[PDB]
Amino acid sequence: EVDPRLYFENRSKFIQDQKDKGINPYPHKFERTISIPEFIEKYKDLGNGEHLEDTILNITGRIMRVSASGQKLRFFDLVGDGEKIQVLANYSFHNHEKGNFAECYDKIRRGDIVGIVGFPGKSKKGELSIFPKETILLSACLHMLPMTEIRYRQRYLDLLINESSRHTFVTRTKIINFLRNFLNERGFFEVETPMMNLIAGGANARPFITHHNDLDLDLYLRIATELPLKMLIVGGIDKVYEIGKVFRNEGIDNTHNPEFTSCEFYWAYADYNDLIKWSEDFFSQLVYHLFGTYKISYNKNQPIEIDFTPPYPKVSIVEEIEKVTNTILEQPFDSNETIEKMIPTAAKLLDQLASHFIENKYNDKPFFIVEHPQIMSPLAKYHRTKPGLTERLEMFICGKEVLNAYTELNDPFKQKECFSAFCTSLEYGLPPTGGLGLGIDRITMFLTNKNSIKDVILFPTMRP
Amino acid sequence: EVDPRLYFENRSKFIQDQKDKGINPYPHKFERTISIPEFIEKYKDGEHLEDTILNITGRIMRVSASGQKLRFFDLVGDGEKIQVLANYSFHNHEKGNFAECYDKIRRGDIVGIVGFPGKSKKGELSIFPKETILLSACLHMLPMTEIRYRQRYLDLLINESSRHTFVTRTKIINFLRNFLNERGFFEVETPMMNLIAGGANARPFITHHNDLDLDLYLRIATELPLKMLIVGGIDKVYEIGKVFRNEGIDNTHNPEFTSCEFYWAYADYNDLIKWSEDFFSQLVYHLFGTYKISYNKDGPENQPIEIDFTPPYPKVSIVEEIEKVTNTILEQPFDSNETIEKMINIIKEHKIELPNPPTAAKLLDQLASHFIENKYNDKPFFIVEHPQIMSPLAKYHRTKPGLTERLEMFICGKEVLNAYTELNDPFKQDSAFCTSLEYGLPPTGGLGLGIDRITMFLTNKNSIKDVILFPTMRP
Ligand SMILES: C[C@@H]1CCC[C@H](C[C@H]2Cc3cc(O)cc(O)c3C(=O)O2)O1
Ligand SMILES: C[C@@H]1CCC[C@H](C[C@H]2Cc3cc(O)cc(O)c3C(=O)O2)O1
Ligand SMILES: N[C@@H](CCCC[NH3+])C(=O)O
Ligand SMILES: N[C@@H](CCCC[NH3+])C(=O)O
Ligand SMILES: [Cl-]
Ligand SMILES: [Cl-]
Ligand SMILES: [Cl-]
Ligand SMILES: [Cl-]
Incomplete structure (x- = not known):
């Protein structure tokens, strides 16, 4: 569907365009409070459909799958230390003062390293997820990864x-x-x-x-x-x-x-x-x-x-x-x-x-x-x-x-006889x-x- | 005072002379039962244990004597030292003349010793050999x-x-x-x-x-x-x-x-x-x-x-x-x-x-x-x-x-x-x-x-x- 050089060159242009308008697309420090393995260990025992909205985590990892139900519902697979969890981004839970939902998530591609502020939960299906309020790009992947x-x-x-x-x-x-x-x-x-x-x-x-x-x-x-x-x-x-x-x-x-x-x-x-x-x-x-x-x-x-x-x-x-x-x-x-x-x-x-x-x-x-x-x-x-x-x-x-x-x-x-x-x-x-x-x-x-x-x-x- | 090349050359002659008498001056294996650190730890506590027979190895670093029937050495292994008190009395004479055996043992030699733990009257921790074997000779003179x-x-x-x-x-x-x-x-x-x-x-x-x-x-x-x-x-x-x-x-x-x-x-x-x-x-x-x-x-x-x-x-x-x-x-x-x-x-x-x-x-x-x-x-x-x-x-x-x-x-x-x-x-x-x-x-x-x-x-x-x-x- 996509040419790779075009992809590379466009993500490049995006990064500079962020720079030119003030955004720092490569932030120095995201203070994370839990690792992905820690997350799984702590919240696997949850019931399906259960949210802990009370509980705010900072987590990081790499996006390896990107998916969507529509514009107001995006799914990703987030990997850190050989483990994976789901990111279920829902327009309504998004802290909209920090940026437009659609523009924030449309710029997030497979391979990106992100920082996520949100709450642990499970989908009705039973999938362990972080539900973001904010997802920050910490370092973009400029090439298309292989599937x-x-x-x-x-x-x-x-x-x-x-x-x-x-x-x-x-x-x-x-x-x-x-x-x-x-x-x-x-x-x-x-x-x-x-x-x-x-x-x-x-x-x-x-x-x-x-x-x-x-x-x-x-x-x-x-x-x-x-x-x-x-x-x-x-x-x-x-x-x-x-x-x-x-x-x-x-x-x-x-x-x-x-x-x-x-x-x-x-x-x-x-x-x-x-x-x-x-x-x-x-x-x-x-x-x-x-x-x-x-x-x-x-x-x-x-x-x-x-x-x-x-x-x-x-x-x-x-x-x-x-x-x-x-x-x-x-x-x-x-x-x-x-x-x-x-x-x-x-x-x-x-x-x-x-x-x-x-x-x-x-x-x-x-x-x-x-x-x-x-x-x-x-x-x-x-x-x-x-x-x-x-x-x-x-x-x-x-x-x-x-x-x-x-x-x-x-x-x-x-x-000496052998040297x-x-x-x-x-x-x-x-x-x-x-x-x-x-x-x-x-x-x-x-x-x-x-x-x-x-x-x-x-x-x-x-x-x- | 001894010329070092003469020293080297004489220890060489000694090695060959051992070969020719049937002796193997670089034996393959001495079965040892204890290390020097182990020895110190076990026998820190003037007494002899003539009953207990140990096999020990290490390097001679000091050589001394109070005449022919009494020789002293410092034996080192793994950064530790003990004394070898070789006493004509305790020597297994079947294995060879005391004076000839111990005359041939110089500073730097690696040895294997079969003997018993003890302390001198003075109180220095020692092994008292019944038999000492040369395992590997030092051909050069070490520095003091x-x-x-x-x-x-x-x-x-x-x-x-x-x-x-x-x-x-x-x-x-x-x-x-x-x-x-x-x-x-x-x-x-x-x-x-x-x-x-x-x-x-x-x-x-x-x-x-x-x-x-x-x-x-x-x-x-x-x-x-x-x-x-x-x-x-x-x-x-x-x-x-x-x-x-x-x-x-x-x-x-x-x-x-x-x-x-x-x-x-x-x-x-x-x-x-x-x-x-x-x-x-x-x-x-x-x-x-x-x-x-x-x-x-x-x-x-x-x-x-x-x-x-x-x-x-x-x-x-x-x-x-x-x-x-x-x-x-x-x-x-x-x-x-x-x-x-x-x-x-x-x-x-x-x-x-x-x-x-x-x-x-x-x-x-x-x-x-x-x-x-x-x-x-x-x-x-x-x-x-x-x-x-x-x-x-x-x-x-x-x-x-x-x-x-x-x-x-x-x-x-x-x-x-x-x-x-x-x-x-x-x-x-x-x-x-x-x-x-x-x-x-x-x-x-x-x-x-x-x-x-x-x-x-x-x-x-x-x-x-x-x-x-x-x-x-x-x-
Ligand atoms: C990799 C570490 C990070 C700490 C700083 C240190 C400097 C390095 C410089 C150096 C250059 C050289 O040509 C030979 C050397 O031995 C040494 C040395 O020992 O230290 O390098
Ligand atoms: C030191 C160890 C002791 C076991 C035997 C082993 C053989 C060695 C040979 C070799 C040669 C070479 O040019 C590239 C290599 O990778 C290898 C290799 O992996 O094994 O050497
Ligand atoms: N590679 C650096 C060490 C710096 C470590 C931070 N990247 C050096 O040779 O001195
Ligand atoms: N240096 C040998 C391995 C040790 C053999 C025993 N000294 C080799 O490269 O294969
Ligand atoms: Cl700072
Ligand atoms: Cl960290
Ligand atoms: Cl090979
Ligand atoms: Cl051994």
Whole structure:
């Protein structure tokens, strides 16, 4: 019925026309006495047709529906904090000294933010409403709202229109709150490490790089928090952690965003077994805390049930490939004879072999791949009984990695061999320690039934 | 006196020699039954409990002896210390010669001890080992500079105050997070890398994403995306996190620092003032049991000053106060030639450094920081009502032409909080951002904090480098 540019340009003209005649169409302050959630909670118990004309409230919110019986009766839907109530504006109840009813309400469109002074009640039908004496425009919406990629570029629209979108992001903040408290209860101490560093260690990933002008120095954005957090373990913070963005300069897809939110903790006097027990407590507890159960459903078409009831399976990556392929790969894995017997180095061959024959062994429970070779795991400690291997675990949910942990290599000698501030700190004595990383975005995806990482990040990185 | 390289090289030989004897000098796991704090709490109350056998761990920080059959150590874990009294008598001799075992244990070593709790005749709380295991040797000699910054792990082990500083830091951040959560604010993460870099007036860092072939700016503030969330209908939203400014480094500037911004739909400048006074007074009482704390502006060497955080705090209106102290009316527009020149002439008469290019915003900023930013040292205080030309995102004052509904709080001359009623008129004002304003931003109050700087005052530090674990430094 309406062109959008015309609409935009007319609402613009209206705003200036208000200005030019004195009205301030963007008032500074509307003193509100109740929120929409508070309103519902207080007045749901009313009878149908009941008005409390005695009781005057100031309320605010955004108009999302506009309707009318005729000129002297207008209806709107008013939303605040994910809740909605009806505004039933009736000519006769209008404080007419403050403005002509028809001109006051004809200028109120879908998307406008308003302030309303009026009395609570219900329609005969039973609809909970505010009945205004005065409705003030506090901030106009200049575009027509919708009744694609837009969810990502214009997230504010998504949050207003789709009830589920908001629910996804509340869950997100809850998940992060749960984790933070889970660790705080267990005596972990939260810290911030630097985002920009001269070296960029902690994982195997191409880094972003930037420049500081006044120091004339190039810097790498951190690809992980591992190295500085161990330094703090040396510094005597026995249980330490960090939740925060890390940056990897690799391609973007459903399960990759160039900046993502991770959590790493390090735990002095711990090892892989404790890390396994912690992982099983954390996930089972988190999921119960959100759903009242350990089985969640997910839409990997029809959904599947993921059962987070512990324990979980622990598949040993060498013993399992050897099992299913009926072939021995002797422990010098980067040797020519073993590299061949697989077949672009040994680390990437194992990654592909694992990524085919092992990472989707289970879909109906989360599970662990354990005991990765030293050649894949340069900071993980050597296995206490199994030459060539390490005390490492990675948890997987539906084929994607969400948790990576190991007993930390704390021998400065067995480490220079896998390759400075960090190297030196190891020489001051790192205690035996267990370390663990989490993919918070990825975990959020499963727990909010999303199948892109872009759905659980408010502003995912996109091209222009 | 021992050469440090010899020391390092000998402890190295010791480690290998352990390897070759079959010993694993970096064991995987010592099952401990109690932490040092737990130990102190349980045994504060000259007696031995030879019956109770504990496994404990920690770092040796002092080494001493009364001959061969009696060795003393200080063992530290989680900021606490107890004594290790190793006594030939109680030693399990099956496990090895007493003298050889304890001769090999040096300052800095991490150990695992199996033994019994007690107190010396003198009364020092101790563990009395039956067996001590080396878990991880310290290959260098610990100290009894800049090293605090490059080797923070050393700082944390040696200086009790350093650790305290960083516990206070995390506590401050916990308090704030709960302070807002209690009041219904919702925490979010916004992007660190953006196509535009608004939010404040600061040169940004720039970086590049390869697969998208795209340049990106590291965020200089969280303001713009957080208002977008206000439009999106999160009425009370916040973020605590790093921001990045590519400008110089000094006592009060680190290229990455931690801020907190919150935005609060339907609030304004007055609510922001009430909040600020509640937050600071409550934070300080929560840490110290009082509202007045002492601070070493001049330095530890010099006499401190008391800062009183009892509310209300002074509100100095920036135009009233400059015109007051300089005896001048500054006509508007402030960017007019006649006023710009008059500001140039005030700065000259008072013999002050004139700014980079002499723009009006930068001249007012200098006038303010010379005549106003140090009006008080004994309490925090507010500078309010800054001109629009200094405050491009702040809303226009509801009664005061030319001005804005802005406040900045100062402690000892440094800015730690900047807040205003948000300009939400897309006309009086990033394209994504500019466009969202066209969808309707409610009247909203917005507020920013410098966490590092607040930490400084609340832990008596004179540099921002003292409250950041790894400050950025030259190599
Ligand atoms: C620190 C956590 C510990 C668990 C494993 C996880 C893998 C990480 C990989 C990754 C790469 C990337 O370029 C963009 C991303 O978003 C992600 C992601 O989300 O998960 O890393
Ligand atoms: C966002 C908060 C709002 C309160 C005021 C505060 C000022 C900020 C200035 C600054 C610039 C810089 O380049 C490095 C820095 O560390 C700092 C700093 O610490 O404080 O900013
Ligand atoms: N830094 C690892 C996570 C921690 C593993 C245990 N140190 C990663 O980026 O995947
Ligand atoms: N973003 C501002 C904080 C102001 C808060 C009010 N919008 C800053 O960087 O200083
Ligand atoms: Cl433990
Ligand atoms: Cl991956
Ligand atoms: Cl409010
Ligand atoms: Cl006012």
